[PDB]
Nucleic acid binder design. Sequence first.
DNA 1: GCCACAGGATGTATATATCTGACACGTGCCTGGAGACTAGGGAGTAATCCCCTTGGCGGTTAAAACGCGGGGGACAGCGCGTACGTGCGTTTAAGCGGTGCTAGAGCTGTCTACGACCAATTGAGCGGCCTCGGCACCGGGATTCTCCAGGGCGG
DNA 2: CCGCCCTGGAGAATCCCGGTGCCGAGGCCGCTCAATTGGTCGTAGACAGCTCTAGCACCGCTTAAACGCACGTACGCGCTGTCCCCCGCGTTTTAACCGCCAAGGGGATTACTCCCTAGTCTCCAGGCACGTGTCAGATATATACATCCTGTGGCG
Lengths: 85, 84, 97, 98, 95, 95, 110, 110
Amino acid sequence: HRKVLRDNIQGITKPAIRRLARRGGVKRISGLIYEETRGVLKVFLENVIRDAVTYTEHAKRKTVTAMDVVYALKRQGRTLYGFGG
Amino acid sequence: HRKVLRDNIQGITKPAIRRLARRGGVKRISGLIYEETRGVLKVFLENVIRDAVTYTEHAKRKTVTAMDVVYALKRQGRTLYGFG
Amino acid sequence: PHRYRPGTVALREIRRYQKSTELLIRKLPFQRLVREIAQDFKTDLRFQSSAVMALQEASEAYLVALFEDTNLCAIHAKRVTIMPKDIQLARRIRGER
Amino acid sequence: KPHRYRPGTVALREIRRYQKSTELLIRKLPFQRLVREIAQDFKTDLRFQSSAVMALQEASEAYLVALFEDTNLCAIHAKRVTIMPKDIQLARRIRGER
Amino acid sequence: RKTRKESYAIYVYKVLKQVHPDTGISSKAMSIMNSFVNDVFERIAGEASRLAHYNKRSTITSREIQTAVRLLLPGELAKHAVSEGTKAVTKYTSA
Amino acid sequence: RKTRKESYAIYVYKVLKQVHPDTGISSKAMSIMNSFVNDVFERIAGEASRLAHYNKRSTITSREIQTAVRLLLPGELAKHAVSEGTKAVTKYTSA
Amino acid sequence: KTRAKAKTRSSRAGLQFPVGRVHRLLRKGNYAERVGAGAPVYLAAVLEYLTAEILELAGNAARDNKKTRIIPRHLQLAVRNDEELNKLLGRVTIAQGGVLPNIQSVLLPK
Amino acid sequence: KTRAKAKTRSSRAGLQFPVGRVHRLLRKGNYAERVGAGAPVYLAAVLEYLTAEILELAGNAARDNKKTRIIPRHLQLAVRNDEELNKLLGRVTIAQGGVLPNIQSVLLPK
DNA sequence: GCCACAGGATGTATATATCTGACACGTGCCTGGAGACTAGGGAGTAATCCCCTTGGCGGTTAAAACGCGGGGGACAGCGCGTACGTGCGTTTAAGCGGTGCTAGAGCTGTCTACGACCAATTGAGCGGCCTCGGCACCGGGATTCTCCAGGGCGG
DNA sequence: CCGCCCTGGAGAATCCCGGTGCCGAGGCCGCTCAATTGGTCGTAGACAGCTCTAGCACCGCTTAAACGCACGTACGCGCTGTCCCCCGCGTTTTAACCGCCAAGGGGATTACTCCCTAGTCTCCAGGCACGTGTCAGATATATACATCCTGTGGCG
C-alpha cells in the first residue's frame, strides 16, 4: 500500500491549541494564534525529525526509534526523560 | 598587602551604561535602569568568575588565566573567540 | 440560563489542565503530521509507537513553555490576550526567530 | 539665540557612533577593580592576567549589549521607546535567567 | 534469552526504601529515574574529561570528579554532594 | 628556548591566499580564526564520537564525520561541506 | 580456588549504587585513558545523594497527593518545587509530568 | 635510507589543511578507540571549506570598508551578515567585533 | 443610579465498592565484578629560571558628576466597536478491540581488511629577526543634518 | 479667523583629502619535532543466514471531541491631556590613562622515582529475566461541599 499524506497540520485542531495554551496559563487567546502555533509546531517538528532521521539513516535502519528522537532532542538541548536510557 | 575592595559596582557609571545601551540601540533610558543593569552585571560576573576560580583552583594555580575565563564562558554556553 | 462570565470557564480549564498530565493533542492526527513531515526526509519510513509518543511529549512540552512565555509577553504589553506578535517576541528573545 | 538639539537626535547619533565603533565602553580600571572585588568572595589573594580581565570585560559588554537589544524589543512591544527595569526583567525571564 | 539491558532499578528502589520505607515507584517513574541517573553520570563524566584534557592529565581522579561536581551542581547541592563524596571516599580508603 | 605551540595560522593564510590574493590578516583576526577552526573541530569530533558510541562502534570514519557535519552545519553550508569532503576522500583514495 | 570472601565496593564505601558498574562505565566511555580508584566511589556517592534527594522530595509529593507510589507527576512536582533541582534540570522535560499549577495575578478575576 | 618520497596527505588529498595534524588531534582527543583513514581527510576538507567561506566573506567586508586587512570587525560583519554563518555561530562572541548597525524603525526619527 | 448577597445552579472533593493488572517478591542461573598478581609510566616532588603582575609615582586631559531648562512621552481616563468566550446541536473520525501479514530489528557465525603499533627518515613549520607600507592621526576644506525665523491661503 | 503649515540659511557634525609617521604584518632562515614509509597482527567490522518481534494495514463500532453557528460582554485599541522625568549642554571636579620603574610571587620547566592503574585469570554471587498473586489504583456513583451570577431590599 503506497499512499501519500498531505496537509495534516490542520489535524492539530483549534481545541488542541487552546488546551495547550490553557496548560500554559493563558486566559484569553487571539484568533490568529492558532495558525502561528501550527507554524511554530511544524518548524520544531521539522528540525527534530531531520536530526532523528539523520541518526536513523546513519544507523543503516529504516525504523525511527524513540532513542533517535531523544538524541535529536538532546542535540537541540531539550533533554527528554523516560524513553529509554 | 591585604586590601579589601568595596562598593566598586558604582565604578560602572551611568554614562558607561548609557554607552552600552546606545551600542544596543536604545534611544531613551529610565532612571532606575542603571541600578538594575549593575545588578545584572554583578550576577553575570559572579557566575563567570566563580566558574573561572573553580578551574583555577583545580589547576592548583593562583592567578586566573584567560583560558579559565574562556572555559567558564563555554560552561555557560557563551563561546568567546580571540583568547587562545 | 446559567452562562458563565467570559473567563471563569477559562480559569477552570487552566486549573484542570495544569492539574492533569495527559497528552493534549490527538495521537492519530499528530502521528499523521509526523509521518507527513518525515516524508520529505526519507521515503518509506517506519516509526515506533515509543518514538511517536516521545515526539508528542517533546512537542507539547515545547508548546506549553512557549505559551507561558507568550502569556508573559502579553501581560507585559498590558493585555490578557496572547497574540501572534507576543509569540514572535517570545521566540525572538529566546533566539528561535 | 543659543542652539539646542531636540531630544533624540543626539541619542541617535550616539547609537550610530557606538554601533559603528568596536571599542570597550567601560573603563578598564573600574571594571578590573569590580572583577577583583567580586572574585575576593570566592578565593582571597587572587591574581589576574590582563588577558583574563580583558576577556571578562569583553564578554560582559557583549552580554549587556545583547540584553539591551532584547530590552529594547520588550519596550517597543509594550508601545514605548524608554527601556525600563520591567523590560529588563521580562527579557531575562524569557531568556531563562529569572 | 536475550542480551541483558542494565539499569539502576534495584539501586533506585533500595534508595527509595531507605528514604521512604512505605513508598513504591511505578514503571514510568523508574524509567525517568534511570534516565536522570544516566544523564547526571554523563554530565559529571564529561566535565571530568574536559578537566583532565585541560590540565593535560590522562586520569580521572577524585579531585577531577569533585571539581566537576562543584561546577555542575548549584550551591547547597554542590556542598552536600562534595561532603557525601568525600565521606564515601574516606570510608573506602579506610577499608 | 621554550615549548613550541601549534596553530592553524599558516594554513589559514594559505587559504586566504587561495581565495583573496590581495588581502591580509591581522594578528587578532588570525587568533579569532584559529579559535573558530578549533571550535568547529571540537563540535564535529564530539558529534562523531557520540554517533560512534550510540551505534556501538569504536571507529571514527568518513561516514561518522559526514553525519556529524550534516547534523551540525545548517542547510547549504552542510551540503557544500559534504560535497567538498566526499571529493577530497575520493581523491585521497584514488591517489 | 577458594580465595577470601568478596566484598562489593558499594558495601566497602557504604553506598547503594554500584561502584564497580560505575567504574566500568567510566572506563568504557572514552572519558580518559586512566581512571582513578576513588573516582568511581566519589561519582557513585554523588549519584546516590542526588537520587536520594529527588526521591525524598518525590515521596513527599506523593504523600501530599495521598498516594503511595511515585509517578512522573510527583517527580515533576518535586523537581520544579525544589529550586536547586529545578536549576540543575532546567533544560529537561519529564515525560507525562505536566506543569506546575500557576495562574497569573492579572489573570485572576476581580 | 632509500624509501618512497615523503608526500604529505594534505597534498595527496589536494587540501591546504594538515591531514596529519587533524589525524593526531582526533587520535589523542579521546573521541573513539580508533580513527579511520578517511576521517582526517573529510574533517580537514570540511574545516578548509568553512575557513575559506568565512575568509572570503571577511575579505569582501574588508574591501567594502576600504581596507586590505581583515580585522575582528570584518570577521564579525561577515559572520553576522551571512545567514548560515550566523546560525552556526549564534552563541559565539567575537572579541572587539562590535555589533551590526541595526536601529529600530520606531526609534528612527519621523 | 449602584451595593451585598441568598439562593439557585453547577462544578467538585469525599467516601464506598468492585475489579484488575502490574509491582514487588522469590528463584534458578550467568556473566561480570572482586581477589590476587605483575608490569610500566604518570604524576608527585623538588629545585630553578624568568616574566608579568602588582604597586607606586607623576602629569595630562578625557570623562564623569552636577545643575538647569523644557518638552517628549509615559500613563491615566474614557469611549467604542469588533472579537473571542460560552454554549448548544451535528458530525466525524479517534480510540479501541481484534485479526492478519511480513518487513526489518536483532542475533550468530566466518572471514577479511584495516588500523594501531613500532622502527627509522626527513622535511615542515614554529621561533626569531629584519624590513617596509597600511592605517591612525593631525591639518585643512567641502558637504550634509538638523533646527528655527519668515510667508501663506482654509472650510 | 486663528492656529496650523510650508519652507532656506546657521551652526554643528560628518565626510573627504593630503602629509607624517610608526609598529605591526610579512618574508626568510636553519632545525628540531612531528609527519611520513613500511611490515605485523589481531581484532573491529562486513556480510550472509536465520528468527520473531513489532510495525503497518484493515473492519467495525462507540462515542468523545471537533465542528459550526448565535450572542454579547469584556477587552484591545485609539484619542486627549497632565506633568514629570529624561535629554541636551555648559561648568567643575575626578581619576583613567599613559609612561616609567621596581621587585617579587608565581607560572612553567626540568630529572627522578615509586606507587597507582592497566591488564589477566578465575571464581562466585549479585543482578537480570521470568513467573505470579495480590494490593494500590481507576472507575461508577451518591453524595454533601465549594463556588459563581443575578434579582431583590435599600436609599440619596
